[PDB]
C-alpha cells in the first residue's frame, strides 16, 4: 500500500533551487546529513537521560556509512530517536517551509548553497548527488516506514517490510551517473575529516569486498 502525496510548493522550488543552481561545491551534502544524523542522536539520548527504557529498542548511538557501487548508492545509518509517519510527511521532521523562505532570502543576499544547514533544511541537499531519495525510519512510538521521492513534486510513504531496524533512520542515495566519486573510500574519508571531525558520534565508514 503505497500514498503519494505532494509537496508544498515552498518544498518543490527548494529542491528545483538544489537540482538546477550551477555549484559545484556538492560533498557538504555528507556533513548535511550526518548533522542531522547527530542531531537525531542527541535527541533519544535526552530522552533516554529520565527514562532508560527509551533506548530498549538499542544502546549503541552511532553513524555508519554505507557506499555499495554495485547499487550505486551511499547510506547513511544512524540510530538516533527515527521519526514517525507524521514526521515522514511534514517534510522530514523539519519546519522547511519557515526554512526555505529564510534560506531564499539569504541566497539573494550574499548566501550560497552550502549555508543550507543553517536554515534547517539541510535533508534536503541530498539532491545534490542523488537523483532518488529513499528514507527508512523507525521510531518508537510509531512502525517502520519508507519515504521515497525522486524530487518532481512528489514523495511517496509506504510501510517498509525489509530488514528492522530497531530504531534510527537510514537515508539512501541513488547517486546521480556523475557523482560515483562519493562511493570511493578515500573521498569518503576526506570529506567525513574536512566537515564532521567534531562529530560527538562514532562514524563507522564500511568497505566494501
Ligand atoms: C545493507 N544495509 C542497509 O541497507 O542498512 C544497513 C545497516 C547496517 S548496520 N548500521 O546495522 O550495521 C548494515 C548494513 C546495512
Same mark, same amino acid.
Given at each position: ?74 547510506? $547513511?545509518?544512524?540510530? %538516533?530517536? !527515527?521519526?514517525?509517519? /507524521?514526521? &515522514?510527511?511534514?517534510?522530514?521532521? @523539519? ?20 549555508? $543550507?544547514?543553517?536554515? %534547517?533544511? !539541510?535533508?534536503?541537499? /541530498?539532491? &545534490?548527488?542523488?537523483?532518488?531519495? @529513499? ?26 517490510? !525489509? ?47
Amino acid at each position: 500500500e503505497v500514498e503519494t502525496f505532494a509537496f508544498q510548493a515552498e518544498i518543490a522550488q527548494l529542491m528545483s533551487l538544489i537540482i538546477n543552481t550551477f555549484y559545484s561545491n556538492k560533498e557538504i551534502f555528507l556533513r548535511e546529513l550526518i548533522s542531522n544524523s547527530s542531531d537525531a542522536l542527541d535527541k533519544i539520548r535526552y530522552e533516554s537521560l529520565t527514562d532508560p527504557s527509551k533506548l530498549d529498542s538499542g544502546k549503541e548511538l552511532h553513524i555508519n556509512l554505507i557506499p555499495n557501487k554495485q547499487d550505486r548508492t551511499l547510506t $547513511i545509518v544512524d540510530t %538516533g530517536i !527515527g521519526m514517525t509517519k /507524521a514526521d &515522514l510527511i511534514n517534510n522530514l521532521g @523539519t519546519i522547511a517551509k519557515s526554512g526555505t523562505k529564510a534560506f531564499m532570502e539569504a541566497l539573494q543576499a550574499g548566501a550560497d548553497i552550502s549555508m $543550507i544547514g543553517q536554515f %534547517g533544511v !539541510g535533508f534536503y541537499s /541530498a539532491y &545534490l548527488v542523488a537523483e532518488k531519495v @529513499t528514507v527508512i525510519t523507525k521510531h518508537n512510538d510509531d512502525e517502520q516506514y519508507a519515504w521515497e521521492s525522486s524530487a518532481g513534486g512528489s514523495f511517496t510513504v509506504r510501510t517498509d517490510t !525489509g530488514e528492522p531496524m530497531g530504531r534510527g533512520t537510514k537515508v539512501i542515495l541513488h547517486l546521480k551517473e556523475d557523482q560515483t566519486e562519493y562511493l570511493e573510500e578515500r573521498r569518503i574519508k576526506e570529506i567525513v575529516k574536512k566537515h564532521s571531525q567534531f562529530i560527538g558520534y562514532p562514524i563507522t565508514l564500511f568497505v566494501e569486498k
